[PDB]
Structure formats: C-alpha cells, structure tokens
Amino acid sequence: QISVRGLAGVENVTELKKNFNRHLHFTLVKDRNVATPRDYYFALAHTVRDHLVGRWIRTQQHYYEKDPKRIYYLSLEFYMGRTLQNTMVNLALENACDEATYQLGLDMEELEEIEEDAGLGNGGLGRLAACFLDSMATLGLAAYGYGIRYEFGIFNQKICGGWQMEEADDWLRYGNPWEKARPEFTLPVHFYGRVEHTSQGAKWVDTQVVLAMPYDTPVPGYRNNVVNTMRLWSAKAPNDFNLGYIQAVLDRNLAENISRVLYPNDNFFEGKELRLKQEYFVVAATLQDIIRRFKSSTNFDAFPDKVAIQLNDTHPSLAIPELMRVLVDLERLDWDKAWEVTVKTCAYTNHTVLPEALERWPVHLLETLLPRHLQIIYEINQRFLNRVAAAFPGDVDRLRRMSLVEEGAVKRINMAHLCIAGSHAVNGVARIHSEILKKTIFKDFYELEPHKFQNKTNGITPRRWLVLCNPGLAEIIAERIGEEYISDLDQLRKLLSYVDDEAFIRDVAKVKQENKLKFAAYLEREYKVHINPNSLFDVQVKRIHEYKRQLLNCLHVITLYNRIKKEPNKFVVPRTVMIGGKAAPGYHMAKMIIKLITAIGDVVNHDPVVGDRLRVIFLENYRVSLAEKVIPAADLSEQISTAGTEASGTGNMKFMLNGALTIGTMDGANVEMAEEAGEENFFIFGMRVEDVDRLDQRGYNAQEYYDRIPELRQIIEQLSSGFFSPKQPDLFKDIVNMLMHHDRFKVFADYEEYVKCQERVSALYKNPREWTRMVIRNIATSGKFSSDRTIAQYAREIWGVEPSRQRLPA
Amino acid sequence: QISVRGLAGVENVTELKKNFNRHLHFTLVKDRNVATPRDYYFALAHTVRDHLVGRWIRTQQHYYEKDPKRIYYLSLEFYMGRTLQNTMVNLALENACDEATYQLGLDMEELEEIEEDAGLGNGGLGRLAACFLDSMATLGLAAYGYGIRYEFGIFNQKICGGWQMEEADDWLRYGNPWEKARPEFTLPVHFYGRVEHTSQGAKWVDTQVVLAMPYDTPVPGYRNNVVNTMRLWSAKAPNDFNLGYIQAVLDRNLAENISRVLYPNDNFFEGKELRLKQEYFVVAATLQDIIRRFKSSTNFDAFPDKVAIQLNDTHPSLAIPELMRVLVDLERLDWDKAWEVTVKTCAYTNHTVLPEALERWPVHLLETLLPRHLQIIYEINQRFLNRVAAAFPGDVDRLRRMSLVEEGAVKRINMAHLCIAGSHAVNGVARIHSEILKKTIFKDFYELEPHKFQNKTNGITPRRWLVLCNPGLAEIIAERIGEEYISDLDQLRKLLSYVDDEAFIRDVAKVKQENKLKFAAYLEREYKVHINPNSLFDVQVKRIHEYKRQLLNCLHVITLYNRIKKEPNKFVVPRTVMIGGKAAPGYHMAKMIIKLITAIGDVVNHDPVVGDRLRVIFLENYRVSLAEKVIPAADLSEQISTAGTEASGTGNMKFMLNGALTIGTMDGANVEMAEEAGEENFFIFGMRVEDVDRLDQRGYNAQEYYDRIPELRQIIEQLSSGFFSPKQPDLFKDIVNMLMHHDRFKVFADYEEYVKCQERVSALYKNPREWTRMVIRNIATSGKFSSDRTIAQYAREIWGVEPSRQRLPA
Ligand SMILES: OC[C@H]1O[C@@H](c2ncc(-c3ccccc3)[nH]2)[C@H](O)[C@@H](O)[C@@H]1O
Ligand SMILES: OC[C@H]1O[C@@H](c2ncc(-c3ccccc3)[nH]2)[C@H](O)[C@@H](O)[C@@H]1O
Ligand SMILES: *Cc1c(COP(=O)(O)O)cnc(C)c1O
Ligand SMILES: *Cc1c(COP(=O)(O)O)cnc(C)c1O
C-alpha cells in the first residue's frame, strides 16, 4: 500500500503464508475452524519472530569474534509497549505481512490490537530506556539492556464513578512470544548474612541465596540486521530453600516476590525493603554476567576499555559498591586499583531534582540486608571526604553537605552522592536541567570535579514515534525527501523548503484530519463516547502529578466553560480537551485530581448551552499503545510544568514530531524545542526559572492572585461551594486548601499568562493555512530530538565508542 | 537395530534430521557451537512432538463428529514419568530417531536421560492412572484424564548421613514441551461464601473466586493414531483479586497456592484445608468442562448415555455433591431426577482398607469452605438412611454404621460412604480386596445394594513396562511369536511352548545378565557404588510403610549376615539386596526404617569376612525413571505385605513381566499372579488373611516369637544394644519397641516362614537352567496383568462402551 512499509514480493508473501499456517498447526495446535483472532495474532508473531533468529545469533557471534567495547544499560524500568509492529518495521516486513494476512482473509491491524503492552515502567524514564535500546541497535553498538522481568507491570487503570481503581497487569497470562528463557545461565544473588574479617580480607557469610534466571528479548536495529539483547532477571528460590514440608514449599514465594511487581511511583522515592531487594538483585546478577563475558575475552586494567556501565538514575547505584566488592573481596585487587577501574567504568544519569524523588536509604536497612556494601560505602565516603578536605581546607560545612552519609533522626545514605563519587561522568537530560544540577543540588560536586558534568538532551525514536504510529505522515514526508530521514532525522530540515507549497500544506492537514477521525472512531467503539472531529484536540497526557500541573489545565477548562455560560451566543473555537494519565496508588492528591477532571466533564459535557463547543474527556489507562493512537491525533500539546521541575519531558518531543503545536513553559527540553523551531512558532508562557526563584525569595502568597483576578476567584468559589460535586459539596476542599495555602508549584502565578496564551492558540486555529504552516516549521526542526542523536553523544562523549550505520550481512 | 523399534527409512530419517536442526535454530535459538546435551534433548522432543499434532487435532475432531460416550477419569495424581521414549514407541519412531540422531553425532540414550520425570503422584495409585490413560488411548476410547498441574511434584530424595532429606521437585524449571497451555478455556471456581434461600431455590453467594487454567498433554495410543488428552488445572488469581497496592498483588499467592504442591503421603489421609481446596478445585473446574462439552452435542436425561465419571478413590468425591449442585441449583432439575442422573454417571474405585487412609473430613471445614455442598451432603444422607430404614426396619445400629455423617468429638463426613451412595458401581482393585470390601468395611452397603459391587483387578501397560524399559526381552519374544502381543498380552501364553527350548532358555538368561550389567554400571557411574553382577539381585522397591514390611526384609538380611559370621567358610549364594523408596516427610517410623537400612549396609558392606557374598544397597530417589532401570535387572521381587493390607500392588506385576521370580504373601494381586503362573512357580509364604484374623482374635503377642526363635532374639538384642549404631546405641529403640509391643502388621509372625522360603529361593538360583525355566513360566502367564485387560473390563462392565483396536487414518 504505502512506500515506507517496504516491498510485498511474491516469494516473500508466499513464504510468510506457509509459515503462518505452520505455526497455527504445530505451535498453537489449532485448525482454522476453531481459531480465534488471538490465535491468529500468535501465529503472526511466531512467523515474524522466526525472521529475527538468524540475525540475533549472528549479531551475538559477531561481538564474540570482534570483541568490541560493550555497553551495559542498567535500569529498573523498560517501558517497551507492543513488539509486533516495531519488529516488522525494523525488518522491512510490514507490507509483506499485510499482504500475506490479507490473502488469508485477515486484517493485520486487528491482530496488532490483541498484543499486550510490555508495561515494565511508569512513564518517561522507562520509555527513555526503551527508545535508547532501539537507537543503540540502529547505531550498531554492542549494547545490552539489563533489568527485572516483573510478573506484573504498571497497573491497568479503570475509572469507576470518576475515581481511579487499579487492577493487576497480568501481561504474561497468554505467554510472551518475544522472550527466550535461559534457565541454563541462572546465577546466585546473596542477601542478609554478616561480614567476617580474616587474615586475607573480608568475607560475606551466612547469606540467604535467591537465584536470578535470565529471559532474553531481541532488540532489532532499523534495517541494519543488528539484533541486540535485553536481558531481564526473574527471581527463583533454590530447591533446598527452607528445606513442615508443605509450608517450606509454599514459603518459596518469599524469595520469588522480588520480581513480582513493578513499584508504580513516577518521580517519587518509596523507601521499602522490597524495592531495595529489587535494586540489588538486578545489580548483582548483571555484574556477574558482565564479568563472565569480560573474562571470556586476570588483568582488570583493561576492564574500562571493554566495559561501560550506564546507571539510569540512582536505582541501580549499588553497582558501584558491588563492583568494588567483587574486585576487592573476590578478585583480590587493592582498593585504589579497584576504585580506578570502577570510576572509569561507571557513569550516572540524573533524571530529577525533586527532593521527594531522590533516593536516601536508611542505614539500618542496608546494615541488615547488605552489610558488606554498607562497609564499602563508609570507606568510599571517608576517602572521598579526605579529598574534599584537601581541596577546600577548613570548609567544614562543605564536608557535611557532600557526605554520602546524611546525619539526622535516622542516618541515610544519599545515593546520588554515591553515584557522583563513583562515576567518571554525570549528566542531566536537558540543557536547563544540567545547568540546574551545577548551580544548585550538585554545586559542591561540580566545584570539586567540573570535568565530570555533562548534558545529554533526551530524545525519542522516530521508528516507533513516527513511522509506526503515523504512517500517513511518514509517507507524505518520504514522497518529498526520500526515506533516509528515518535514521537521520536532521534531514527533516529539508521540509522548510515546502512551507509555502500548497500541495504539501494540504497533505499535512489531511493527514491530521484522518488521524483525528480515526481516533474519534476509536473513542466511540471502545468507550461509547461521542466527540466532534472538527474541534481543536487539546491534549495533556502524562502521569498525574502536582508538578505537571494538570490542575492548571483544569482551571483553564473551567474558565472557558464560565465564559461560554456568560455569553452563550458568542462564537468560540470548539475544543475537545483530553487529559489522561495514571496516578500512583498511594498519591492521594493525584487521585483527587483525576476525580476533579471527571467531575468537570460531568458538568460540561451535559450542559445543553455548551453544545459541542467544549468537551472534556478523561482518557483511561494511558500507556504506550494509547500514546501511539492519541499523539498523532493531537492539535495542541500541553507541556505546562512549573519552570525548573520537569528535567526534560519526552512526550513533548513525540507531539512535535507528529504535527501538534505546543503550549508550554520554559522547562526541561521545551526550551531547546522552542530554540530549534523559533519562539514565534511555539506558544510560550509563564514564569521562567529565575522568576520562580524571585517569587520564593519574597514568598509565594496565593491569596494575592485570588484577590486580583475575578475569573480565578469565581472558579475557587465554584470548587469550594460544590458546583462540581452537588451531593458532596466539600469533596474538593483538599484541592482548594492546597491551592490557597501550600502550593509548591505556583498554579495561580501562571494562570493569567496561560489563559491569554490559550486565546492566541484559538486565534491561530481559526486560520487553518497559517496553523498548518506553523506545524510544518515544528516538524521540520524536530530532528535534534531523535534518540539517535542522543545515543551518538553518549557513545562519543561518555562511553568512548563510535557509532556505525553499516549493515551486517543478512 | 532391533525389530520392535520400527523402521528407519531414508526419507523419514532425512526429515527428522532437518526438523531437529530447524528446532535447534528457531525454537531453541542456539547453534551447534554452544549447544549442550540439554539443548539437544529439547530439539529432539520438539521434533517428536510435531508428529503428535496432526493426530491430536484429528482425534479430537473425530470425537466431536461421532459424539461417542466420553469417559472422564478424575484423579488427584497422574504419575507420568518421562514422555520422549514413550511417544516414539507409540508412534513407531524409535529406530528412525535413533538413526537420525546417530547421523548428527549424538547418542539418543544420553539425551533421554536429560528429561525430568513428570512426578505428579506418590506411587501406585498415581502410576495406575497413567497406565490407564495409555490403555484407554490404545483401546480407542474417547477418554480424558483430569487432574491438577502441581508446580512441585513428589519431592526429590537425598540421603544424608543415612537419613532421608527432601528437596523440592522443580520439574518445570526448563519448561515442559509436552503440555499446551490453554488460557482461553480458563474457568472460575468458588470457595467460602454463604447460602441464601430464595423463592426459587438456594443460591451460593459472596464467594471468593479462583481461576482454573487448563494445560493439555497428549496421550498417544499404541500405533493406532489415536491421541487423547490429559487436562491438568493450574490455579490463577483474578486480576481484581484483593483490589495497600503492593501487598494486594503479593497476596495473589494465597489463591495460587492451591496448585503449588502435591501432598506427599502414600496411603494416608492428612485432613488439611489446602488438600480439601485441591480436591474441590479439580472437581469444580472439571465438571464445568464436562457439562460444556455435553451441551455442545437442555435434556439431562441423556447425560449418563454421553458421560461416565470415574472417581480414583475418594479424593475427587466432591464430584457427587457438585454435580447435584449444578443440576439442582443452576439447571433447576428436581432433586430425584438430578440424583438419578448423578448415580448413573458416577462410579467409584476403592484402593485401600487401611483406616488411616480413609478420608473423613471434619464438618466444620466443609461448613466454612463449601457451605452449599455440606447442605447437599446432609440431604443425600437423610434420603439414603430413609432407604436403609425401609429395607432393614428397626436396625438402628445399621443406621448409625451406614450414615455419611460420623458422630463423635468432631463430626466428620465419611467420603467412602458418600461415594457408594452416589455411584452405580463400586469396585476394588484385586479379587481378594474386592472380597474384603464386601465382607468387612462395606458389608452393610453390599447387603443393601449387592449389584453395585464389582472387582477390576489392576494391570500395567506393557508399552512402558516391557517394550520401553526392556527392549532386549521384547525382541527375543517377538522373534518367536511376532509383535502382536504388545497390544494383546495374553499371546505371551505361546511362550509355554518354549520352556524346553535350549536356545530360548539361553536368550532369556542372557537378556537378564545384560540388564544386570547395565544396572551395575549405572550404579558405579552415578553413585560410585560397586556391586557383583553375578549375585542374585534381590529387590524391594516401593514406598516405605509399616504395612509393606521393609522391616521383615531387614530381619532377613541381618539373619543372612549373622549366619555368615557364624560359619564364614561355608558357601552361600551371593546376594545384592536392594531396597528403595520414599518416606512421607511426616512419617517418623518410615524415616527410621530408611536409617536402619542404611545402618545395616554400613556394617555389612564393610565386613571383610562377608566379602562380596552379601551387599545391602539403599536405592536413592526411587521414581518411575529408576523403576524402568532396576526392574529389568531384578532376579527376585519382594512382595511381602501383611495379608489383607496391599489392595493390589502393581510393582509386583512389573517384575513378573520382566523376568523376576516373586517371593510374596497371599495379598492383593499376588494371589491372582500365583494362580496364573501356578503355585509351584511362585515363592509363597506366610499367613493368609484368615490366619491374620485368627491371630487378632486370640491376640498378637510378639514376645512369644522372641522367646521361641533364637535367631530372632539375637537380632533384637543387636538392634537394642547398638550393634548397628555404635555412637548412638539407643538409636533404634522406637523400632524395637514397636516390634515388641505394638506391631499392627505382625512382622515376627511371618519371620520363620519367610526365612525358610528365602532358603528355597537360594537353592533354585544354584541351578540356572531351572531358575530360568520357572522365569519363562512367569513371563508366559503375565498376560492377565495388562491394563488393556483391566480397561476393557471397566469399559464393558462399568462405562457401557466397547473398546476398539481399529486404526484412525494418519
Ligand atoms: O529522563 C526521562 C524522564 O525521567 C523522568 C523521571 N525522573 C525520575 C523518574 C523516576 C523516579 C523514581 C521512580 C520512577 C521514575 N522519572 C523525568 O520526570 C522526566 O522529565 C524525564 O523526561
Ligand atoms: O490401586 C493402585 C494402588 O493404590 C494404592 C493406594 N491406595 C490408596 C492410595 C493413596 C491414598 C491417599 C493418598 C495417596 C494414595 N494408594 C494401594 O496401596 C495399592 O495396593 C494399589 O496397587
Ligand atoms: C512518552 C511517555 C511518557 C512521558 O511523557 P512526559 O509528558 O514526558 O511525562 C509517559 N508515559 C507514556 C506511556 C509515554 O509514552
Ligand atoms: C509401580 C510403582 C509403584 C507401586 O509399587 P507397589 O510395589 O505396587 O507399591 C510405586 N512407585 C513407582 C515409582 C512405581 O513405578
């Protein structure tokens, strides 16, 4: 059908059809008389998977022979989404599979919808890791993603009576065809125990053992025949575990719980023992695998030449003391030499400055769980602080500020400080964020070792986030500039030559309109909700958080509603306002925000005076597969975090690539997006970081805004009085109280500028041609935000390896 | 190589080789440079499995079209053992696979040893169910085995310092290629709750739900292209289960524990809640499946014409009240009609008369777990006792004896009484056992309904238990009488014509000698133990129990040792005495017996005066795969249970078929074995059932035997004084005390006759030709003990269906 989807050759189509039938019979043990759509999905998945195998084996053989430097990306989260379409895209099989299934009487798009997301992450951080794996394969790096195979990923969200309910994501129920269990490479991981000091070193003894069993998933690069590995560990009890008899067998669940469930907090630290066990489990199993592979190449001098470990935030920070443990206690290196190797091997990426998100573990937990690691951390701390003391003599407050050990009621270890001390490079994830790190929370460290600090602005893969989810847009682009841009996104700059081209303008607008119709149909079909596809699609999709300010959007929506009710017969640009995202189950305020959004919808969507000029929809169960549907359909991307709080954002980049305009604060990567596109082509509003600092210095008083802005006072009085909750008039009192007296994120301070900026959005939407021209200017300058760019920078500036676009032989 | 193993055609061998290579690459994702023997085993298993698929689909299609009466065999245990060789045997692929693997440079026997037993049973009862499934497929019956897929089967036994240790049997660790998960046919099962009485019937409400997910395993018939199904249920929590958040997800293990582990008791009742949950889980899921299949053929009159349910002991007895529940509460049949259907559908097999093995559940457990079922059982009981009262008016003691409800400290439900009331047929498992049932524990029921009571003497499948484990013997038989006997074992009678044939005599003895050499090599290789292959191999393998009297064997062994020490320079026939079997983990006396056997070995095996004239070996981890090795190697089969205690025995039959002579009491099927072969060709000793009754009437006094038999007194004094435990002289005091004062199984009473009979064994072994002739007379008369005979009797006399030997098309 469309060019970028590859060839449908007769030989290939014939072969796919016979292999589909073979799997249906032999693999699934079904015949066509009783097979369901799910069986058909599985038959196609196995058929496509077979095409990965030769390339997977050959890639891994190639790395064994050539022995390149290996990159190990450690993360507690990999938010992969679905695999079938991505695999077809990267192997150039999409049109052939479409044809084959068509000839068998099946609709491939319908089969694609059966696949479960692999939801092994919370949001941005987990999805970044997934985009990174795609880029590393596409750039030919010998890279491995290491994580935990959670039995239950991020919960499925149901909305009941306007409230979030959680249900378990039993994603493995029907089986996962994309992983390969590797029980033969199972490794032991130790917990608890005690340390004995002998004549020749410390010994960690009397430990409890849990086994780590690996499952490998292939990660195909884009049309280069490279297939890298994501290895995820699963917890298993040893067979003599607890070994009256029946109870001992049932108690194996105590060990196996380590990999049972993903902690569902986004940008928040919950200091529970089970989470710490997860963090050590992934690190301990991974490092044995790394060392095994290194020895199969005595001399650890070369370790940093052959190994890079990248820590995705502090979650795998125990890699640092674990590597020291292994080198010192087991390989018998002297401390100084072990430390040199460790520092040169490890690098740390910071993804947040919010204090409630920073990991600070109680010493007593580490003392009990990981006694040798605590000893090592103390020794690291003493030696580090000796360096600080020599560099800044007499500066005793610096010593307390920089210590890895925080004093107080409960002593804690600051894991971010540990990562900086033990890494040769520390980066933030957007230019403003990296600058904030050097100016504020890591200022002391930057003064001591300025060379360590870098920036690596985040990106997204244009395979998943354009070609896969928006084939219509990919095609009209390819018609003009060819296909090379899919792995070299900077080529989209060539589209600036088409900003006055009437045909291109028409095609860009038609693709958006088709995406909007398709999404509006999806809504009716799966959720019996009826929306106007000619309205402006105004979307904020992301995790629910105070700092992301879904509440500010809410205030705007109520303002629009009140303005309509005040002058019903005046024309306003029609909007469909869509807000979606999950709240952490324990985060009461975030759950209240969801209820507020649905409550606003209940009033607005049923007011006959409003008609279809304003609709407010809560998009349930936002996840990667839903992002792939809604983002291509959006007109306006809401990126409205308080300046200084969103380290980067990546949803922002997805919307830019897909032909939405952005309304946003100068926060995270929004700053670089505006710089690339031009400030004239971006709807920027609100306080900058320096304005937030000025407000904090004199003191934020929300009452001042309430007193001076009548439209804002009206809304607060409506909330307080029960206008949006007639049967429970005091329902939103927690929200009002927070806004009025302890709002850390200054919602009222950006309200006026936000509403005024939204008026400018509506004015531009009234002129379709000029709206579309501004869109073309955004799409054309989105190239910087490819994760191929990001990964090439990590490769050259941190890992010391050169990317390659050269094909392996097929 | 050998005839009965089928053809090795060039086309077939070529095809097997290419499919082996295909699976190795695509299924296992390995190349030949890194593949291990385990990968090679899996490649062969997938290759052989592919040959089952077409026949499996076609068989099940055939039953859908023809709609025969379906037989459902319900059991808590299916002791399947390994599947690879059995599958090759039944599909006539053994020689082709041997050739294919040979050409690939692999030894197929070595690959076969990698497969784990499916150990989903304790011993005889579980293995009977497995032999039955093989026979039902071989006889063309539309039969389904339904059970529980335990995550952990019977424990692996380790011997440490002479003591049994248990370790978990993690049989699924590397995956099970023989099962097919069928998550799409998952069914709900209810627990707890309460009963509400409405205008139109009872309602069971407020229940907790656990899901039952089926896994299907193919059961191939012998060369008839029939492939039946064994469906095993696995417990899954619903996704809203318990739905702070993390704990709710972790607590899913509470529901999933139902299928976690097999209770490891043989012929013993442990009345625990988890066991009751297992019993209901299998019954409830199975009956929904049965009813679904029946409706896909409103009129339940025809149900008994289309369905037979066979209860393997009382473990699935809840089928009776569950079927009533469904028919009355859900389908709204009147009680009398529902009862008629239930009785005509269900049949019960009893496998034990030991009081400690009979299931009697406390009413309070059923009250809490299964409140509606208790109500139904009470109603069954009232209506049944009304029938008793009308038949035997005024006999009030009969009413109390026959009641389903046992009065006492705790009221209990007698499940055997429930099964008899609700079944149209009740059978024992050997003629003497069936007679005991009518004379003793079920006498009252027999008087009320004599027509219900039958006998079905047990059997064993000659596919696994001759062709597979003893190909050498199968071959020399086939050379004389052809291959037809493998599915018509009565043809072995033709071998009586060869009892004076010098060539046949030589071949039978050579096959035994080769089996003994092979087993002696296995011992050294895997357990560094050195045995004399010219000695008489004297073997007792079976679960450790007081009633099976491993202790009586022990007394004989010590007697032989003491006789040697008394006259060292006299000739005695050399013996290797092998005893193996698992003890239930909670069964203290059985664990002490294991320790006694190893302690005797420690003394005997290291006494230089004994030399290699007597060796005592404890065979560790006895299980189906070990039985397949040791049974072909045995000379003498020890079947020495106290008369009246072993309902049938099936090991006895395995030894007979494989060329061992039997020393045994007249118990269980030993009686029929002696009758078939001739008493002259069997070493029979000891009390008959009527002698045991006479002793019980006057009172068993063990001291009398101690006082009159000096050889016996010597042994007891050795045990008591610490001769077999120097460092712990009082180690065996529990054993001595039991023997002397509370031996329910009268070990001393059979001692003299046993020792004298063993002397006759030794005398015959000195004459190889006459020993071998007696062997031929046993093998030749073993035909009755095929489970094909057994199943044809169930089919004709209980289920009302005709067996068929006709091939389905391939
Ligand atoms: O760099 C990728 C993204 O990482 C998010 C992130 N930081 C910390 C976490 C986090 C902490 C604890 C548990 C789970 C996730 N998540 C930031 O909020 C985004 O701005 C950023 O675009
Ligand atoms: O009929 C097959 C075999 O069944 C055994 C048996 N009866 C009850 C059980 C039993 C009870 C509770 C839990 C597990 C197993 N096992 C008998 O002891 C054998 O004689 C007989 O040959
Ligand atoms: C991209 C993405 C995110 C991150 O969005 P932000 O707006 O940067 O927070 C979160 N969730 C899902 C499912 C995503 O695809
Ligand atoms: C046949 C068999 C049994 C039953 O043996 P009996 O001597 O009848 O108790 C027990 N266990 C295994 C592994 C068997 O193969």
PDB file of N, CA, C and O in Angstrom, chain A residues 477 481-496 779-784:
ATOM      1  N   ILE A 477       5.977  12.770   3.911  1.00  0.00           N
ATOM      2  CA  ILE A 477       7.334  13.263   4.019  1.00  0.00           C
ATOM      3  C   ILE A 477       8.271  12.538   3.059  1.00  0.00           C
ATOM      4  O   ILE A 477       9.107  13.171   2.386  1.00  0.00           O
ATOM      5  N   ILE A 481      11.242  13.897   0.376  1.00  0.00           N
ATOM      6  CA  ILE A 481      12.664  13.906   0.693  1.00  0.00           C
ATOM      7  C   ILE A 481      13.295  12.521   0.769  1.00  0.00           C
ATOM      8  O   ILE A 481      14.463  12.393   1.096  1.00  0.00           O
ATOM      9  N   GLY A 482      12.531  11.489   0.445  1.00  0.00           N
ATOM     10  CA  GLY A 482      13.071  10.134   0.427  1.00  0.00           C
ATOM     11  C   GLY A 482      12.949   9.548   1.840  1.00  0.00           C
ATOM     12  O   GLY A 482      12.376  10.182   2.726  1.00  0.00           O
ATOM     13  N   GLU A 483      13.529   8.371   2.030  1.00  0.00           N
ATOM     14  CA  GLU A 483      13.371   7.597   3.272  1.00  0.00           C
ATOM     15  C   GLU A 483      14.516   7.723   4.243  1.00  0.00           C
ATOM     16  O   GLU A 483      14.429   7.188   5.352  1.00  0.00           O
ATOM     17  N   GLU A 484      15.593   8.405   3.859  1.00  0.00           N
ATOM     18  CA  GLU A 484      16.797   8.405   4.677  1.00  0.00           C
ATOM     19  C   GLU A 484      16.598   9.052   6.043  1.00  0.00           C
ATOM     20  O   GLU A 484      17.378   8.796   6.952  1.00  0.00           O
ATOM     21  N   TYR A 485      15.567   9.877   6.176  1.00  0.00           N
ATOM     22  CA  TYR A 485      15.378  10.656   7.405  1.00  0.00           C
ATOM     23  C   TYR A 485      15.001   9.763   8.598  1.00  0.00           C
ATOM     24  O   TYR A 485      15.161  10.184   9.730  1.00  0.00           O
ATOM     25  N   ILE A 486      14.507   8.554   8.328  1.00  0.00           N
ATOM     26  CA  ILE A 486      14.058   7.646   9.389  1.00  0.00           C
ATOM     27  C   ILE A 486      15.218   7.254  10.319  1.00  0.00           C
ATOM     28  O   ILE A 486      14.996   7.018  11.520  1.00  0.00           O
ATOM     29  N   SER A 487      16.447   7.229   9.799  1.00  0.00           N
ATOM     30  CA  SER A 487      17.639   7.024  10.633  1.00  0.00           C
ATOM     31  C   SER A 487      18.598   8.208  10.589  1.00  0.00           C
ATOM     32  O   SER A 487      19.758   8.085  10.960  1.00  0.00           O
ATOM     33  N   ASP A 488      18.107   9.364  10.158  1.00  0.00           N
ATOM     34  CA  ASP A 488      18.902  10.580  10.149  1.00  0.00           C
ATOM     35  C   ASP A 488      17.898  11.711  10.192  1.00  0.00           C
ATOM     36  O   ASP A 488      17.609  12.360   9.173  1.00  0.00           O
ATOM     37  N   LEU A 489      17.330  11.940  11.383  1.00  0.00           N
ATOM     38  CA  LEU A 489      16.147  12.790  11.475  1.00  0.00           C
ATOM     39  C   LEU A 489      16.414  14.261  11.162  1.00  0.00           C
ATOM     40  O   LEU A 489      15.475  14.992  10.879  1.00  0.00           O
ATOM     41  N   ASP A 490      17.673  14.686  11.223  1.00  0.00           N
ATOM     42  CA  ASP A 490      18.026  16.070  10.857  1.00  0.00           C
ATOM     43  C   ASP A 490      17.632  16.403   9.418  1.00  0.00           C
ATOM     44  O   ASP A 490      17.471  17.571   9.076  1.00  0.00           O
ATOM     45  N   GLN A 491      17.445  15.388   8.591  1.00  0.00           N
ATOM     46  CA  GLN A 491      17.011  15.615   7.205  1.00  0.00           C
ATOM     47  C   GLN A 491      15.630  16.227   7.087  1.00  0.00           C
ATOM     48  O   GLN A 491      15.288  16.791   6.029  1.00  0.00           O
ATOM     49  N   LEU A 492      14.827  16.151   8.156  1.00  0.00           N
ATOM     50  CA  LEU A 492      13.547  16.841   8.156  1.00  0.00           C
ATOM     51  C   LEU A 492      13.679  18.354   7.935  1.00  0.00           C
ATOM     52  O   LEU A 492      12.688  18.986   7.607  1.00  0.00           O
ATOM     53  N   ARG A 493      14.847  18.932   8.190  1.00  0.00           N
ATOM     54  CA  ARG A 493      15.070  20.357   7.870  1.00  0.00           C
ATOM     55  C   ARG A 493      14.768  20.677   6.406  1.00  0.00           C
ATOM     56  O   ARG A 493      14.418  21.805   6.087  1.00  0.00           O
ATOM     57  N   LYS A 494      14.921  19.690   5.529  1.00  0.00           N
ATOM     58  CA  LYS A 494      14.604  19.888   4.112  1.00  0.00           C
ATOM     59  C   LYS A 494      13.159  20.285   3.894  1.00  0.00           C
ATOM     60  O   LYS A 494      12.838  20.894   2.868  1.00  0.00           O
ATOM     61  N   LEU A 495      12.281  19.967   4.850  1.00  0.00           N
ATOM     62  CA  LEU A 495      10.870  20.339   4.727  1.00  0.00           C
ATOM     63  C   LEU A 495      10.600  21.838   4.825  1.00  0.00           C
ATOM     64  O   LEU A 495       9.521  22.280   4.478  1.00  0.00           O
ATOM     65  N   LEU A 496      11.557  22.615   5.316  1.00  0.00           N
ATOM     66  CA  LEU A 496      11.381  24.072   5.347  1.00  0.00           C
ATOM     67  C   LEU A 496      11.160  24.616   3.925  1.00  0.00           C
ATOM     68  O   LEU A 496      10.457  25.604   3.744  1.00  0.00           O
ATOM     69  N   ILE A 779       7.614  20.387  12.706  1.00  0.00           N
ATOM     70  CA  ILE A 779       8.025  19.065  12.251  1.00  0.00           C
ATOM     71  C   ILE A 779       9.410  19.143  11.664  1.00  0.00           C
ATOM     72  O   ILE A 779      10.275  18.304  11.941  1.00  0.00           O
ATOM     73  N   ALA A 780       9.655  20.195  10.873  1.00  0.00           N
ATOM     74  CA  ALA A 780      10.907  20.350  10.158  1.00  0.00           C
ATOM     75  C   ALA A 780      12.125  20.543  11.039  1.00  0.00           C
ATOM     76  O   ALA A 780      13.240  20.287  10.608  1.00  0.00           O
ATOM     77  N   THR A 781      11.915  21.035  12.255  1.00  0.00           N
ATOM     78  CA  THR A 781      13.008  21.320  13.181  1.00  0.00           C
ATOM     79  C   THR A 781      13.037  20.325  14.370  1.00  0.00           C
ATOM     80  O   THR A 781      13.741  20.552  15.333  1.00  0.00           O
ATOM     81  N   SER A 782      12.316  19.216  14.253  1.00  0.00           N
ATOM     82  CA  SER A 782      12.237  18.212  15.341  1.00  0.00           C
ATOM     83  C   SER A 782      13.434  17.247  15.329  1.00  0.00           C
ATOM     84  O   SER A 782      13.617  16.458  16.266  1.00  0.00           O
ATOM     85  N   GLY A 783      14.264  17.310  14.278  1.00  0.00           N
ATOM     86  CA  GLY A 783      15.408  16.414  14.135  1.00  0.00           C
ATOM     87  C   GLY A 783      16.344  16.243  15.321  1.00  0.00           C
ATOM     88  O   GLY A 783      16.831  15.135  15.573  1.00  0.00           O
ATOM     89  N   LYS A 784      16.627  17.324  16.051  1.00  0.00           N
ATOM     90  CA  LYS A 784      17.536  17.252  17.193  1.00  0.00           C
ATOM     91  C   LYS A 784      17.059  16.228  18.258  1.00  0.00           C
ATOM     92  O   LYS A 784      17.869  15.720  19.047  1.00  0.00           O
TER      93      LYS A 784
END
